[PDB]
Amino acid sequence: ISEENLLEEVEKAKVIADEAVKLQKEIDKRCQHKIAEMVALMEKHKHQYDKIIEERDSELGLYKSKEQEQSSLRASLEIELSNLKAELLSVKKQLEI
Amino acid sequence: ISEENLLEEVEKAKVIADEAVKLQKEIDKRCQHKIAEMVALMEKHKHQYDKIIEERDSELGLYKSKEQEQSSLRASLEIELSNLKAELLSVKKQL
């Protein structure tokens, strides 16, 4: 209706647009900063894991070497004691006859 | 001592060795399997993360062009509201 009413309504829309612009920046700024912090944390973790995972071939190589030796030891103890039993069971058979 | 004594002693040593060996090997292997489990979990996590982080350049891409569209629209809105104001002020001067 009034001319002065149109002008007031424009002026207010203009102040409200400006506040909305300002507050939306602040929201989006905070949200993107959170996203960056989480990305960064994920990345730092991903890297720690990756180092662990890369080191495994060489750790497992060295384990495999000790394990082979231990398997030979276990086997030999077993064979030795199995052989001692055989030998004494044979001497108890010569003697019992 | 007796030969029978020796035999019985050997047989005790044998069955004990056999079983000690068996348990040591179970313990040794369980420990390896436990390590592998943890590693496999870390890798799955690591790949989940890589997927999130490597679609980031793309997500930033579309974000960017959407943010430029919104800011362009907003700059034109502000030009128009400011032309509306000047013009109504003009008519306001003319009473």
From Swiss-Prot, chain A:
Tissue and organ distribution: Testis.
Subcellular location: Nucleus; Chromosome; Chromosome, Centromere
Organism: Homo sapiens (Human)
Name listed for the protein in its UniProt record: Synaptonemal complex protein 1
Assembly description: Structural component of synaptonemal complexes. Homotetramer that consists of an N-terminal four-helical bundle that bifurcates into two elongated C-terminal dimeric coiled coils. This tetrameric building block potentially self-assembles into a supramolecular zipper-like lattice to mediate meiotic chromosome synapsis. Self-assembly is likely initiated by local proton density at chromosome axis, which is predicted to trigger antiparallel back to back assembly of adjacent C-terminal ends into tetrameric structures that anchor to chromosomal DNA.
Effect ascribed to mutating L7A: Impairs pH-induced C-terminal tetrameric self-assembly
Purpose: Major component of the transverse filaments of synaptonemal complexes, formed between homologous chromosomes during meiotic prophase. Required for normal assembly of the central element of the synaptonemal complexes. Required for normal centromere pairing during meiosis. Required for normal meiotic chromosome synapsis during oocyte and spermatocyte development and for normal male and female fertility.
Region (Required for pH-induced assembly of C-terminal ends into antiparallel tetramers) residue spans: 4-97
Sequence motif: Nuclear localization signal, positions: 7-10
Lineage top rank: taxon: Eukaryota
Recorded domain comment: The molecule is in a coiled coil structure that is formed by 4 polypeptide chains. The N-terminal and C-terminal regions exhibit a prominent seven-residues periodicity.
